[PDB]
Write a protein that holds these residues in place. Structure first.
Motif, PDB file in Angstrom:
ATOM      1  N   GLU A 100      -2.993   6.947  -7.278  1.00  0.00           N
ATOM      2  CA  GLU A 100      -2.028   7.925  -7.767  1.00  0.00           C
ATOM      3  C   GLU A 100      -0.602   7.590  -7.331  1.00  0.00           C
ATOM      4  OE1 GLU A 100      -3.863  11.129  -5.783  1.00  0.00           O
ATOM      5  OE2 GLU A 100      -5.556  11.291  -7.176  1.00  0.00           O
ATOM      6  N   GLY A 101      -0.466   6.609  -6.442  1.00  0.00           N
ATOM      7  CA  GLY A 101       0.837   6.224  -5.919  1.00  0.00           C
ATOM      8  C   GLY A 101       1.471   7.323  -5.081  1.00  0.00           C
ATOM      9  N   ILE A 102       0.653   7.968  -4.255  1.00  0.00           N
ATOM     10  CA  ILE A 102       1.123   9.068  -3.414  1.00  0.00           C
ATOM     11  C   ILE A 102       1.115   8.628  -1.950  1.00  0.00           C
ATOM     12  CG2 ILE A 102       0.549  11.362  -2.533  1.00  0.00           C
ATOM     13  CD1 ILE A 102      -0.562  11.994  -5.364  1.00  0.00           C
ATOM     14  N   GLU A 103       2.294   8.596  -1.332  1.00  0.00           N
ATOM     15  CA  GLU A 103       2.427   8.155   0.055  1.00  0.00           C
ATOM     16  C   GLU A 103       1.714   9.135   0.981  1.00  0.00           C
ATOM     17  OE1 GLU A 103       4.916   8.265  -2.107  1.00  0.00           O
ATOM     18  OE2 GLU A 103       5.652   6.197  -2.224  1.00  0.00           O
ATOM     19  N   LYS A 149       6.267  10.243  -3.681  1.00  0.00           N
ATOM     20  CA  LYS A 149       5.555  11.161  -4.566  1.00  0.00           C
ATOM     21  C   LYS A 149       4.619  12.060  -3.750  1.00  0.00           C
ATOM     22  CE  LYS A 149       2.216  11.094  -8.419  1.00  0.00           C
ATOM     23  NZ  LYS A 149       1.496  10.192  -9.369  1.00  0.00           N
ATOM     24  N   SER A 150       4.478  13.316  -4.163  1.00  0.00           N
ATOM     25  CA  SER A 150       3.680  14.280  -3.408  1.00  0.00           C
ATOM     26  C   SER A 150       2.548  14.876  -4.227  1.00  0.00           C
ATOM     27  CB  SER A 150       4.566  15.419  -2.896  1.00  0.00           C
ATOM     28  OG  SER A 150       5.679  14.930  -2.173  1.00  0.00           O
ATOM     29  N   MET A 177       0.837  -1.203   0.000  1.00  0.00           N
ATOM     30  CA  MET A 177       0.000   0.000   0.000  1.00  0.00           C
ATOM     31  C   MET A 177       0.867   1.245   0.000  1.00  0.00           C
ATOM     32  SD  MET A 177      -3.190  -0.987   2.773  1.00  0.00           S
ATOM     33  CE  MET A 177      -4.132   0.653   2.240  1.00  0.00           C
ATOM     34  N   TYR A 178       0.295   2.375  -0.410  1.00  0.00           N
ATOM     35  CA  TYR A 178       1.023   3.632  -0.350  1.00  0.00           C
ATOM     36  C   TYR A 178       0.849   4.285   1.016  1.00  0.00           C
ATOM     37  CZ  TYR A 178       2.399   3.236  -5.154  1.00  0.00           C
ATOM     38  OH  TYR A 178       2.977   2.808  -6.330  1.00  0.00           O
ATOM     39  N   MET A 179      -0.161   3.828   1.752  1.00  0.00           N
ATOM     40  CA  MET A 179      -0.342   4.236   3.152  1.00  0.00           C
ATOM     41  C   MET A 179       0.904   3.908   3.975  1.00  0.00           C
ATOM     42  SD  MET A 179      -3.037   2.663   6.132  1.00  0.00           S
ATOM     43  CE  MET A 179      -4.568   3.282   5.076  1.00  0.00           C
ATOM     44  N   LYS A 180       1.373   4.872   4.768  1.00  0.00           N
ATOM     45  CA  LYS A 180       2.443   4.631   5.732  1.00  0.00           C
ATOM     46  C   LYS A 180       1.836   4.823   7.117  1.00  0.00           C
ATOM     47  CE  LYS A 180       5.103   4.314   2.223  1.00  0.00           C
ATOM     48  NZ  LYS A 180       5.622   2.988   1.788  1.00  0.00           N
ATOM     49  N   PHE A 181       2.454   4.248   8.140  1.00  0.00           N
ATOM     50  CA  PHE A 181       1.896   4.338   9.488  1.00  0.00           C
ATOM     51  C   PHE A 181       3.008   4.651  10.473  1.00  0.00           C
ATOM     52  CE2 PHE A 181       0.934   2.288  13.583  1.00  0.00           C
ATOM     53  CZ  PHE A 181      -0.339   2.806  13.858  1.00  0.00           C
ATOM     54  N   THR A 182       2.679   5.385  11.522  1.00  0.00           N
ATOM     55  CA  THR A 182       3.621   5.491  12.628  1.00  0.00           C
ATOM     56  C   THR A 182       2.906   5.748  13.941  1.00  0.00           C
ATOM     57  OG1 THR A 182       5.730   6.431  13.394  1.00  0.00           O
ATOM     58  CG2 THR A 182       4.135   7.964  12.412  1.00  0.00           C
ATOM     59  N   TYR A 183       3.631   5.557  15.038  1.00  0.00           N
ATOM     60  CA  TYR A 183       3.092   5.809  16.372  1.00  0.00           C
ATOM     61  C   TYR A 183       4.065   6.716  17.088  1.00  0.00           C
ATOM     62  CZ  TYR A 183      -0.685   4.467  19.463  1.00  0.00           C
ATOM     63  OH  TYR A 183      -1.869   4.422  20.171  1.00  0.00           O
ATOM     64  N   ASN A 203       8.620   6.648  10.917  1.00  0.00           N
ATOM     65  CA  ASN A 203       8.402   7.788  11.816  1.00  0.00           C
ATOM     66  C   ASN A 203       8.166   9.105  11.073  1.00  0.00           C
ATOM     67  OD1 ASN A 203      11.023   9.610  11.960  1.00  0.00           O
ATOM     68  ND2 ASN A 203      11.715   7.483  11.798  1.00  0.00           N
ATOM     69  N   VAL A 204       7.525  10.048  11.757  1.00  0.00           N
ATOM     70  CA  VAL A 204       7.135  11.315  11.139  1.00  0.00           C
ATOM     71  C   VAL A 204       8.267  12.064  10.420  1.00  0.00           C
ATOM     72  CG1 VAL A 204       6.219  13.601  11.566  1.00  0.00           C
ATOM     73  CG2 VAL A 204       5.187  11.664  12.656  1.00  0.00           C
ATOM     74  N   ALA A 205       9.439  12.158  11.043  1.00  0.00           N
ATOM     75  CA  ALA A 205      10.542  12.916  10.453  1.00  0.00           C
ATOM     76  C   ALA A 205      11.078  12.274   9.180  1.00  0.00           C
ATOM     77  CB  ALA A 205      11.665  13.094  11.466  1.00  0.00           C
ATOM     78  N   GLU A 206      11.209  10.951   9.200  1.00  0.00           N
ATOM     79  CA  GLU A 206      11.645  10.227   8.016  1.00  0.00           C
ATOM     80  C   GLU A 206      10.616  10.323   6.893  1.00  0.00           C
ATOM     81  OE1 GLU A 206      14.661   9.244   6.999  1.00  0.00           O
ATOM     82  OE2 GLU A 206      14.846  10.493   8.814  1.00  0.00           O
ATOM     83  N   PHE A 207       9.334  10.329   7.254  1.00  0.00           N
ATOM     84  CA  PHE A 207       8.275  10.488   6.265  1.00  0.00           C
ATOM     85  C   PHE A 207       8.413  11.829   5.551  1.00  0.00           C
ATOM     86  CE2 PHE A 207       4.160  12.064   4.864  1.00  0.00           C
ATOM     87  CZ  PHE A 207       3.694  11.000   4.104  1.00  0.00           C
ATOM     88  N   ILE A 208       8.591  12.894   6.325  1.00  0.00           N
ATOM     89  CA  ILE A 208       8.798  14.217   5.750  1.00  0.00           C
ATOM     90  C   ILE A 208      10.034  14.244   4.853  1.00  0.00           C
ATOM     91  CG2 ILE A 208       9.285  16.648   6.219  1.00  0.00           C
ATOM     92  CD1 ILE A 208       7.708  16.257   8.851  1.00  0.00           C
ATOM     93  N   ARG A 209      11.141  13.664   5.317  1.00  0.00           N
ATOM     94  CA  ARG A 209      12.379  13.662   4.531  1.00  0.00           C
ATOM     95  C   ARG A 209      12.176  13.007   3.171  1.00  0.00           C
ATOM     96  NH1 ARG A 209      16.105  10.499   2.591  1.00  0.00           N
ATOM     97  NH2 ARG A 209      15.319   8.588   3.587  1.00  0.00           N
ATOM     98  N   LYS A 210      11.422  11.912   3.144  1.00  0.00           N
ATOM     99  CA  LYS A 210      11.204  11.175   1.906  1.00  0.00           C
ATOM    100  C   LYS A 210      10.302  11.929   0.935  1.00  0.00           C
ATOM    101  CE  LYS A 210      12.497   6.631   3.509  1.00  0.00           C
ATOM    102  NZ  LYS A 210      12.169   5.174   3.552  1.00  0.00           N
ATOM    103  N   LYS A 211       9.356  12.687   1.478  1.00  0.00           N
ATOM    104  CA  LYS A 211       8.541  13.587   0.670  1.00  0.00           C
ATOM    105  C   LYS A 211       9.415  14.690   0.089  1.00  0.00           C
ATOM    106  CE  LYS A 211       4.048  12.595   0.999  1.00  0.00           C
ATOM    107  NZ  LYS A 211       3.207  12.477  -0.227  1.00  0.00           N
ATOM    108  N   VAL A 212      10.196  15.327   0.958  1.00  0.00           N
ATOM    109  CA  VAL A 212      11.059  16.443   0.573  1.00  0.00           C
ATOM    110  C   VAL A 212      12.134  16.016  -0.436  1.00  0.00           C
ATOM    111  CG1 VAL A 212      12.835  18.032   1.457  1.00  0.00           C
ATOM    112  CG2 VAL A 212      10.613  17.871   2.601  1.00  0.00           C
ATOM    113  N   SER A 213      12.650  14.801  -0.272  1.00  0.00           N
ATOM    114  CA  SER A 213      13.704  14.280  -1.143  1.00  0.00           C
ATOM    115  C   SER A 213      13.163  13.774  -2.480  1.00  0.00           C
ATOM    116  CB  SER A 213      14.445  13.137  -0.449  1.00  0.00           C
ATOM    117  OG  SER A 213      13.635  11.980  -0.373  1.00  0.00           O
ATOM    118  N   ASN A 214      11.837  13.726  -2.601  1.00  0.00           N
ATOM    119  CA  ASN A 214      11.150  13.130  -3.749  1.00  0.00           C
ATOM    120  C   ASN A 214      11.355  11.615  -3.891  1.00  0.00           C
ATOM    121  OD1 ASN A 214      11.826  16.237  -5.154  1.00  0.00           O
ATOM    122  ND2 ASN A 214       9.707  15.514  -4.936  1.00  0.00           N
TER     123      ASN A 214
END
Lengths: 595, 597
Positions: B242-245, B297-298, B1-7, B283-294
């Motif tokens: 759309e394949g958007i995380e 997909k955003s 899935m393109y869904m990611k999860f964290t706690y 985790n939240v920070a890594e999720f943001i980094r992967k969005k920012v790094s492309n």
């Protein structure tokens, strides 16, 4: 599953009336229509019509067949009164099919004649229209203590909901969009039997999910996607555990079922996909009925007055959501004004930004025309010895028995002149019934349709102006033939149509502030009014008023319209409605009228 | 899935301090703790402590062992600074394990020392605490360009967000609750990378789903139900096509992992269930980094100022939501006041309704005590030649290296007197370090906990009052040494604690309106203050103020409280905290203190 699903379909056609014929007001109106032949592909038949309306009425048959293969009680449908009447007139076979399905197969939903934005009308007009709504629907809803109600574009205020709920004894279910909810968050209120205090009475309320509804209506998700969006995306794991029924409610125009040739099959596959998931398809009314009866288990207080939620005044189901500043909808699409920061918006049209300022002027002008006509009726009925405004109201309501005669005849409901005239029995039925006619023409001319679109030049804007022009001129002529000075009061109103572009100055529109800053400027206003047709330099408003005036206006004033207006450019040619571009038009460059 | 999860897990203990010992201020504080034996059940094992704090510190080891079972980078964790410090002092092996995990295995999240409601403090205190938060976390965040941040109870205002973001050069991610979002609806904003304008700079924000988080934390859904609520209930069908995380973000107290004996295994089973559904845990920070790094997909504009959303001032993650009138959270839980209609609320406690008016008085009194302490510090440093308020602020921030000395020393950071005194090196360190101690006792006394509960009579209220009483008496005594009239300005502040019930009148609380109409009456106030323990007839505020005063006041002042009060009734016994009732307590009727040694 304990999840329940249902769809609501709203059926409405503004019609293709370009000129209303002279009449006594004793009968339903007669009129000439647009000739702009067009076709709609449905699966593997092309459905042809002389104009959009007739093509669609034929199409309603393919739709009724599809609805017939669904289970009983599964969905709900509302037909706008004049639209259903027009089907009876043009295709009485389909009317019988449609009418049977509403009696026995789908839950029938009450709606308003002529589809106006209700909160954009005076309370007087709203009351008449509300009572007529329930009157027209009596053969479908006679013995039902609970009934669903469809406000045009779901545009609701607290005042409007009160008027509506007061016009009936039954319990009202308002069908709305969840983006209209306030005082609760969306997941909090979702899928439960909520209520809504209508100041004196309380109504039930359901709010559709916009993004899934449009995913179907506009074909942006396949059947697998639609099924998953509902069965998975809307799951309430707590209610599944507690064994508590909840309702996923979606809604679209009935005409979405023919927006492309595969829509009827898509919808059938979707509903099938859901049933296979263990999801029961059950209408909003039968859902509530099954709750209150305790056939369905509830949360404590469900379907009661502790489950009251709020609704945002002037919110809708179809507003420009990309301009929302609160995550909710408003009525800025029809007014051209965002209320939250009180600015005038613009929209894109054929590669240019267009000020939506014209909608405000259009709406404002019609409040004034509506009142001019209403006070005319009241003033003239007064001369006939009718002083009680409530008796005049009852009359204007009973006059539906004239306007939609055959519909009522089909169900052996009284259409007698003696019925219609009872509250105002002291008046000459010849004068009274002409006034009833003039009033209903004014009502017919208040279609919301013109202000839904980005540009003013459309067939529906023309129709509104032509219809009210008919009403005004006839009222004017009644005052003339009585030798009254008030004839000019009415001619002044008619003149406001002809000289529509002057209203930018007369309405002090320059004081208003644009969203970007340029939308309430002079040039912004005048650009927005440019003709969209080859064969007319006149704006659509002036066009339609001249078109009707040239045939109905007394020769002397009929002369000045000739002295100041080149009449050869008074034709029903308008621009095209963007939403109708999926149709197969003989002429795609503009909405034509033929010889 | 393109869904990611964290706690995200937030760890905090208020501690069990009942009396701070006298000290010079040159060293971390020392204190006596409550003796109230209690045990926690974890799987088949009993974990026993001499008090709740000590039982929970042992429990943290079980929690760490479980976090180590997760994949690297799966979840984020904040530890409140003094909580981590108490772990270090009591069980350094457990601190070692936790800090290793924070260094390498879970994303470390910055949070505020002493867990106050930040928008209920003055800007000055908030500024000191914000700067200390980032200093204390230096060992875990030094190389990070983006860091997540946990405001206590997620209570936020734009002003508070500005103070926090101004205190670091890093980009901040605020971890919040989706019921805090405004100007957008919940489904409209959900799971995307959104930002939030806090004036000069912007922060990223993510909002938890409370109903799923609580279904785990309070064990109201089994593992299959939790898996379904996430994998199905949170699906974004469009982003899947759309394949958007997108990120489903949930959060709870770390202590929810020991709220019952099966929580640790439930959590691991839930994560396993999600992973088997094709959902990556990130985790939240890594999720943001992967969005920012492309790498991900955003949506157009995602993770930028184009994707700004608004947050309601004073909203939270844990408010009394059943009283919400706007579908969002607020801070009425801690103030006792619903803002929308300006009424004083009540809650149930032991099957009677109890007015929450006491929370407003307690909050208002502490605002005043806080300023008395701060202005006393500023005034006494002025007498030492220190006039620049910015140098005083720098000193108070550096003083955290004394207060949490062993933590900074563990990480080889300078805690020397010369380092701490640098911004005010003209001042006498004997006086300055005493003032630093006093200021930090005041900060420690601002735990939000007492106001979380429905009943005033709890061990945390006793602790806050005993701790602020320590600070006030010490400050008073410094002024006495100068032969100052200002000593009685401070005695006045301490008198307001002793005579707490009089504040109903002095704060004009009778002018306020109750939600139901009775919550602001004299009867409602006095009933709310009644002792919950049979061995004290005094309300808990007076009780704690007396407990410290009978030990610390100069002899003349001790004789005054000895005459007005029965000092044998000044004991640390209090009512129990409702949320601690799952523990196996030696005295489960009230929160005892065994006083024989």
């Amino acid at each position: 599953m304990y999840m329940k699903f249902t769809y609501h379909f709203h059926a409405y056609q503004p019609g293709d009336i370009i000129y209303v014929h002279d009449g006594s007001g004793w009968d339903p109106i007669k009129y000439s229509e647009r000739l702009s032949p067009v076709a709609l592909e449905i699966r593997e038949e092309e459905v042809k019509g002389r104009n959009w309306t007739r093509a669609m009425i034929k199409a309603y048959e393919y739709v009724d067949e599809t609805l017939r293969m669904l289970d009983e009680g599964a969905v709900s449908v509302d037909f706008e009164p004049f639209t259903l009447y027009m089907v009876l007139k043009y295709k009485p076979k389909i009317y019988g099919e449609i009418v049977e399905t509403l009696e026995t197969h789908v839950e029938p939903t009450v709606t308003v004649p002529f589809h106006p934005i209700m909160p954009h009308l005076s309370h007087f007009e709203q009351e008449i229209l509300s009572k007529v709504s329930f009157d027209f629907y009596l053969p479908f809803i006679a013995r039902k203590p609970i009934v669903s109600f469809w406000l045009p574009e779901n545009v609701i205020t607290k005042d409007t909901a009160k008027i509506v709920t007061s016009a009936t004894d039954k319990d009202v279910v308002f069908l709305l969009d969840e983006r209209q909810f306030i005082g609760v968050n969306i997941p909090q209120a979702r899928f439960s039997c909520n209520k809504y205090l209508c100041d004196g009475k309380s109504a039930f309320v359901f709010g559709r999910i916009h993004y899934i509804s449009d995913a179907f209506a506009f074909n942006t998700l396949d059947v697998e996607g639609l099924t998953r969006a509902v069965a998975e995306g809307c799951v309430d794991v707590f209610k599944e555990k507690e064994g508590i029924e909840y309702l996923v409610f979606l809604s679209s125009d009935l005409e979405s079922l023919v927006a492309n040739p595969k829509q009827l099959d898509r919808f059938l596959g979707w509903i099938d996909g859901l049933k296979k998931r263990g999801i029961e398809i059950i209408n909003v009314a039968e859902f509530i009925r099954k709750k209150v009866s305790n056939e369905y288990k509830s949360l404590p207080g469900e379907c009661s007055e502790s489950f009251r939620i709020n609704v945002k005044d002037y919110s809708s189901w179809s507003d420009y959501f990309d301009l929302s500043v609160d995550g909710r909808t408003s009525d800025m699409r029809w007014t051209g004004i965002r209320r939250e920061d009180n600015v005038v918006i613009h929209r894109w049209y054929k590669e240019r930004k267009v000020s939506q300022l014209w909608k405000f002027a259009f709406m404002k002008l019609f409040r004034e025309l509506n009142r001019a006509v209403r006070f005319g009726v009241i003033d003239m009925l007064r001369t006939q010895g009718v002083s009680d405004i409530e008796k005049i109201k009852e009359f204007l309501v009973r006059y539906s028995r004239v306007f939609f005669r055959e519909h009522y005849e089909y169900f052996e409901l009284d259409t007698s002149v003696d019925y219609v005239m009872e509250p105002i029995h002291e008046a000459d039925p010849s004068l009274a019934l002409k006034l009833g006619r003039i009033y209903y023409l004014m009502l017919l001319a208040n279609h919301s349709c013109p202000r839904f679109w980005e540009n003013i030049d459309t067939r529906v804007t023309f129709g509104n102006v032509a219809t009210i022009s008919k009403a005004l001129i006839e009222l004017m002529e009644l005052y003339m033939e009585e030798n009254e000075e008030r004839a000019n009061y009415i001619f002044l109103e008619y003149m406001k149509l002809l000289a529509f572009p002057q209203l930018y100055y007369d309405y002090d529109l320059f004081r208003m502030k644009g969203l970007e800053g340029w939308e309430t400027t002079e040039k912004a206003w005048f650009e927005s009014l440019r003709s969209e047709v080859p064969n007319s330099k006149y704006n659509v408003v002036t066009r339609a008023a001249l078109y009707v005036g040239k045939r109905d206006l007394p020769p002397d004033m009929r002369s000045v319209i000739d002295t100041l207006y080149d009449l050869e450019e008074a034709v029903p040619d308008t621009g095209h409605i963007p939403g109708e571009m999926h149709g197969k038009w003989e002429n795609k460059e503009w909405c034509e009228h033929k010889g």
